[PDB]
Design a protein around this ligand. Structure first.
Ligand code: CLA
Ligand code: CLA
Ligand code: CLA
Ligand code: CLA
Ligand code: CLA
Ligand code: CLA
Ligand code: CLA
Ligand SMILES: CCCCCCCCCCCCCCCC(=O)OC[C@H](COP(=O)(O)OC[C@@H](O)CO)OC(=O)CCCCCCCCCCCCCCC
Ligand SMILES: CC1=C(/C=C/C(C)=C/C=C/C(C)=C/C=C/C=C(C)/C=C/C=C(C)/C=C/C2=C(C)CCCC2(C)C)C(C)(C)CCC1
Ligand SMILES: CC1=C(/C=C/C(C)=C/C=C/C(C)=C/C=C/C=C(C)/C=C/C=C(C)/C=C/C2=C(C)CCCC2(C)C)C(C)(C)CCC1
Ligand SMILES: CC1=C(/C=C/C(C)=C\C=C\C(C)=C\C=C\C=C(C)\C=C\C=C(C)\C=C\C2=C(C)CCCC2(C)C)C(C)(C)CCC1
Ligand code: SF4
Ligand code: SF4
Lengths: 136, 31, 155, 80, 34, 155
């Protein structure tokens, strides 16, 4: 599914546990101009390869911490995948193809409230109704 | 000195009545 | 001079290391040949051996350290205390069986745990075997402790 | 998951999207501010609830709010 | 002469009620039916 | 105020009534988790628990009411009576098994009996287990009564 070389480190005990085989698993891919040393989110030092890299991780936050670190190495082509135990690989970051800090067309407003927050109703007005005060 | 064996046995048999009623009420409150 | 600690499965991404403690052939021999992992055993045979070993040693703390350890019935008190722990352990195993338990894990030392511990029926078999073996092991420890005088005929 | 909602006092300075450790937030086109952009939270299932976006928000009380809700494996941040 | 009831009821309250109660509650909180 | 007695399965044509004695959730809890009907058991595990309980109670009337109940040999005669009757029961179970028996019936209380009691091999495994459980239950009742003076003496 995913093409890449595992970075060079002698293994840690901070890697990925039984949740990977039973619940969900993440992968990060990036390419590097040269081979250089980076820090794992699990702890420890590892050498990335000159070329395509692949590093399986337990949480998505590990991949976004690593992708924030890879920007210091001037590497902005990183991709984060979500892998299920069925083998289902889905592409989540960046999902649109553009990083979320930049505006891209085709994105819609999700969970936008067209009022200020002091204009939310009282909790007693929404009591027993099954809705929250901040809904809609 | 104290009460007899018959009175303790009768009180246990009577205490079976709020035991059964408490079982029914606690199950009704859950239901 | 060569490296002795390795990542397991030749994959460093796992939270695993192959060490002398973890992956010695002597360690992997001893662990894989316990009745919890010895290949070719029914759940009852595994439990029966586990129970005999456990009821055997659990006699000792109850017999030598209990409240009645200075009385004439120290060994009988240790026997009954061991049987009470074996029954409580059987109850714990039956509760563990009935709760739809999660799968037994493979590891560096043991790459394949048995199918005895993958199902409710195998765990029920294991637990009943642990009860029988545990009572047998506590009884044999009581019997060898109360009859040390037969070594006088060995002399 | 947690609920992250964006109110209309946004100025589109994109700081919540940058602060977010789990990629919940993104910037979408808009016309109610000078920067012509709001923040949007489509991936609230990845939200751990750490509120770095509320720390990052410059408006007087919070164009963005996180409302802590039900807990999952992702929202609790478990690697196991 | 009902003082023998204590040697029944105090072991029941101390062992039988906790084991039965915690066994019910453990299998109930792990159950996925209701 | 409402009716408490119903036809079973909402069909009045079967020779069946759901009554409180028949279909209480407490009664349906208790019968369905008796080892004859409890889910997650092999036929050996069912026969072993059924045997244990029956040997244990069958120790009683032989020991306390038999011919030797006033002798010093009372508890051992009761043990031998319970073991002989457990063996006769095992012989009856094996003859029932080897007769190619009919299937176990579901009822109002048990919606679905186990597959253990549907063939010959499940009954033979049950009877083999019933023998072991019965002798063990009779022996444990024998030791808990014949040593009941010492067990009270440990207190
Ligand atoms: C004065 C004490 C008191 C009373 C009257 C109640 C009453 C109630 N509790 Mg409650 N509760 C209490 C103390 C009490 N609680 C305390 C101290 C705790 C903290 C541990 C709780 C924790 C608690 C939980 C977690 C739950 C309740 C639930 C309930 C309801 C159903 C009870 C039930 O399932 O019975 C079952 C009990 C029995 C059948 C035992 C009876 C056996 C005797 C011997 C007869 C009922 C409204 C449940 C509820 O509302 O769910 C809808 C529920 O889930 N309670
Ligand atoms: C009171 C505590 C206690 C004691 C003394 C024992 C003792 C024993 N158990 Mg045991 N056991 C216990 C609690 C205990 N258990 C608990 C709580 C459980 C539930 C999981 C079990 C479940 C269990 C099973 C299922 C089995 C045993 C087995 C054994 C026997 C082999 C020992 C062995 O290989 O361990 C190995 C010990 C470890 C792997 C622990 C790690 C030790 C570290 C790594 C060593 C340190 C390294 C350093 C260089 C020194 C031994 C008689 C086996 C047996 O019955 O053999 C007949 C067997 O199959 N046990
Ligand atoms: C509190 C701890 C404790 C105590 C008081 C005892 C006490 C005893 N053990 Mg024991 N044992 C223990 C822990 C303990 N053990 C542990 C942790 C293990 C490791 C599994 C063993 C393994 C062990 C074996 C293998 C044997 C004993 C034996 C004995 C008995 C030796 C003296 C005798 O026969 O009289 C004595 C009852 C010996 C014996 O005769 O068994 C009754 C024997 O064969 N024990
Ligand atoms: C935590 C420390 C501790 C320790 C060591 C003890 C020790 C003891 N207590 Mg005590 N007690 C304690 C805390 C402790 N107590 C506390 C906190 C309380 C609460 C108030 C009590 C209340 C209490 C009462 C009321 C009584 C005792 C009694 C006893 C004695 C008998 C226990 C028995 O039957 O063994 C049971 C032990 C086991 C079944 C297993 C023990 C674990 C084994 C030995 C370790 C195995 C690990 C092994 C080394 C690893 C093997 C690896 C393998 C690969 C080889 C013993 C001296 C009784 C007595 O008469 O005192 C003299 C008694 O009546 N205790
Ligand atoms: C509230 C209820 C309760 C009751 C009735 C008892 C009763 C008893 N405890 Mg216990 N205990 C309890 C709560 C309770 N405990 C709790 C909550 C703790 C933790 C603090 C303890 C900790 C504790 C320790 C550490 C010890 C006891 C011991 C004892 C025994 C008394 C000492 C003696 O001379 O007997 C001697 C009698 C015997 C050895 C015969 C054993 C009785 C058989 C095995 C009953 C079978 C039941 C089984 C589960 C099935 C007695 C059986 C001591 C003991 O000897 O127990 C083994 C002991 O070592 N208890
Ligand atoms: C003719 C009828 C009869 C007779 C003489 C006995 C006699 C006895 N039963 Mg028993 N029992 C019977 C019918 C009978 N049972 C029936 C129909 C059941 C229902 C299944 C039981 C269930 C039963 C239990 C659960 C226990 C006894 C126990 C006992 C013993 C009590 C002595 C003691 O305290 O130690 C004694 C051997 C107790 C005992 O200690 O026996 C080992 C005990 O625990 N019996
Ligand atoms: C039908 C009535 C009846 C009864 C009650 C007895 C009773 C007895 N006879 Mg006897 N006998 C009878 C008729 C009867 N006999 C007849 C018709 C003859 C033919 C001539 C004999 C010939 C005879 C001889 C030759 C001897 C006896 C002996 C005995 C005694 C011991 C037998 C024994 O161990 O039972 C064993 C009993 C069982 C294994 C099972 C008991 C049944 C249980 C208790 C039923 C429980 C059902 C329960 C309530 C349901 C539970 C519900 C559940 C939900 C819990 C006992 C007092 C012996 C003795 O010494 O006399 C004192 C003796 O030597 N009898
Ligand atoms: C002692 C406490 C024992 C409670 C467990 C009850 C065993 C009943 C066993 C039994 O009757 O089961 C029957 C009863 C009804 O539930 P069902 O078994 O019908 O379950 C199906 C349900 O899911 C309904 O769809 O189950 C419950 O009540 C379980 C919920 C108990 C939840 C706990 C609430 C009680 C806690 C409050 C009491 C503690 C504080 C002490 C106050 C002094
Ligand atoms: C390896 C090693 C070790 C260890 C060891 C151990 C820990 C031991 C243990 C041991 C033990 C722990 C043992 C056990 C034993 C047991 C036995 C000896 C038992 C037997 C039993 C029996 C035989 C029974 C039978 C019976 C009866 C009687 C009745 C009925 C039932 C039955 C059948 C079950 C050490 C650490 C030192 C060091 C290193 C090496
Ligand atoms: C529910 C109920 C009831 C009933 C009751 C009854 C019916 C009971 C029974 C009881 C019984 C009836 C019991 C029993 C028990 C038993 C046991 C306790 C046993 C054990 C055994 C064992 C442990 C053994 C083992 C062994 C040995 C030792 C050797 C080898 C072999 C073997 C392994 C087998 C009534 C009506 C009151 C009321 C209501 C409720
Ligand atoms: C070897 C091994 C291991 C380790 C372990 C260790 C190293 C230790 C532990 C330890 C332990 C595990 C211990 C425990 C102990 C316990 C005790 C301490 C008990 C006590 C008890 C009692 C005292 C009771 C009594 C009684 C009875 C019996 C009946 C009724 C009455 C009463 C309740 C009183 C493992 C897991 C990794 C795995 C497998 C193998
Ligand atoms: S709470 Fe955390 S994960 Fe959620 S939107 Fe804010 S910064 Fe992102
Ligand atoms: S920090 Fe606040 S005002 Fe700025 S883009 Fe984010 S939600 Fe809008």
């Amino acid at each position: 599914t995913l093409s890449g070389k595992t970075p060079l480190f002698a293994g840690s005990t901070g890697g990925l546990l039984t949740k990977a085989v039973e619940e969900e698993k993440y992968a990060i891919t990036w390419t590097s101009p040269k081979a250089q040393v980076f820090e794992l989110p699990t702890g420890g030092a590892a050498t990335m390869h000159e070329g395509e890299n692949l590093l399986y991780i337990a949480r998505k936050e590990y991949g976004i911490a690593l992708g924030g670190q890879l920007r210091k190495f001037k590497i902005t082509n990183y991709k984060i995948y979500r892998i299920l135990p069925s083998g289902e690989t889905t592409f989540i970051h960046p999902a649109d193809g553009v990083f979320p800090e930049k505006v891209n067309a085709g994105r819609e407003k999700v969970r936008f409230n067209a009022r200020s927050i002091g204009e939310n109703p009282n909790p007693s007005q929404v009591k027993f109704s099954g809705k929250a005060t901040y809904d809609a | 000195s104290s009460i007899s064996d018959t009175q303790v046995y009768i009180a246990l048999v009577v205490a079976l009545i709020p035991g059964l009623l408490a079982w029914r009420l606690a199950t009704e409150l859950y239901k | 001079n060569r490296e002795v600690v390795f990542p397991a499965g030749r994959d460093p991404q796992w939270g695993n290391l192959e060490t002398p403690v973890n992956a010695s052939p002597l360690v992997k021999w001893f662990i894989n040949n316990l009745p919890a992992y010895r290949p070719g055993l029914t759940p009852f045979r595994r439990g029966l051996e586990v129970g005999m070993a456990h009821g055997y040693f659990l006699f000792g703390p109850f017999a030598k350290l209990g409240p009645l350890r200075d009385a004439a019935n120290a060994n009988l008190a240790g026997l009954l205390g061991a049987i009470g722990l074996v029954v409580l352990f059987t109850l714990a195993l039956s509760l563990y069986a009935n709760s739809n338990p999660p799968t037994a894990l493979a590891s560096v030392t043991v790459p394949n745990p048995p199918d005895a511990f993958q199902s409710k029926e195998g765990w029920n078999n294991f637990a009943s075997a642990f009860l029988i073996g545990g009572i047998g092991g506590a009884v044999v420890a009581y019997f060898l402790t109360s009859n040390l005088a037969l070594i006088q005929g060995l002399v | 998951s947690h609920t992250v909602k964006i109110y209309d006092t946004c100025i589109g300075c994109t700081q919540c999207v940058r602060a977010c450790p789990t990629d919940v937030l993104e910037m979408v086109p808009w016309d109610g501010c000078k920067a012509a952009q709001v923040a949007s939270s489509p991936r609230t299932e990845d939200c751990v609830g750490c509120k770095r976006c509320e720390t990052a928000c410059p408006t007087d009380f919070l164009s963005i709010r996180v409302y802590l809700g039900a807990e999952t494996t992702r929202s609790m941040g478990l690697a196991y | 002469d009902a003082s023998f009831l204590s040697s029944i009821f105090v072991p029941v309250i101390g062992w039988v009620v906790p084991i039965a109660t915690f066994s019910f509650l453990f299998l109930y909180i792990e159950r996925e039916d209701v």
